[PDB]
């Protein structure tokens, strides 16, 4: 929802980091993307694909995830 508004300046986040072997400087250095927790910066391009095909918010992303969970079942 932040990336749709400013696609060419905001760094896309793939998923969150929870690693208990981290020290504090590693926690600080991975805190990017405008969030308050360590994240990995996405390289898969799912942001551009999902934005181009008409998804704008987080709600329809979750609904698509539910539909694919149901389809897999």
């Amino acid at each position: 929802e932040q990336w749709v508004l400013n696609p060419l300046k905001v760094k896309p986040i793939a998923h969150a980091i929870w690693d208990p072997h981290f020290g504090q400087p590693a926690v600080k250095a991975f805190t990017k993307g405008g969030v308050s927790y360590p994240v990995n910066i996405a390289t898969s391009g799912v942001y551009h694909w999902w934005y181009t095909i008409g998804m704008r918010s987080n709600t329809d992303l979750y609904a698509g995830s539910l539909f694919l969970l149901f389809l897999a079942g």
């Binding site: 929802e1 987080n58 709600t59 979750y62 995830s65 539910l66 969970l69 149901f70 897999a72 079942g73």
Partner: peptide
Amino acid sequence: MISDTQIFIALILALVSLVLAIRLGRALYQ
């Protein structure tokens, strides 16, 4: 944003998919 209830619903669907995957694995194992 997403709430706790939505994550719980996704977890329930994933558990249903886990049961179905276990059943498919048992069917394939004869």
